[PDB]
Amino acid sequence: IYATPADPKALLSAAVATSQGGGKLPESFMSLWRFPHMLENARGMVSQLTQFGSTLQNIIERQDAEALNALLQNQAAELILTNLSIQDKTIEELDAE
């Protein structure tokens, strides 16, 4: 009776999420400025905070594009070792021929 190998199984990876707790607001402070001047002051901070958030978002995208890029070259360096050993068996076959 002839040994048939089993079907190749599917690999499976788990992606769990993380969760960080919601913070709380600081204590409010009563400044000297009236509302139109303090709103314009607060809008200048929040506009700067959006520019940090757009910059931070681009850095996160760009570290994941380069973590992937280093992953693809390490995988290409490991895969070429097998093809070197396959090509050795090609040359060894022609010596047997």
């Binding site: 990876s13 992606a15 978002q57 996160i60 994941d64 992937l68 992953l71 693809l72 895969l79």
Partner: protein, 49 residues
């Protein structure tokens, strides 16, 4: 080919575990489209003012 299967799985595991994955941008789009619609009603209010 079993290496390439494991290498494909490592790229698939990387896309799911990285921070800027699809679940980030579903969260960013869903939250910003809620902000952008509420901010729309505020700006049309002052265009009418």
């Amino acid at each position: 080919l079993k290496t390439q299967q494991e290498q494909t799985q490592s790229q698939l595991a990387f896309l799911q575990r990285k921070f800027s994955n699809q679940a980030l941008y579903n969260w960013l789009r869903g939250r910003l489209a809620a902000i952008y619609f509420q901010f729309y009603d505020l700006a049309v209010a002052r265009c009418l003012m």
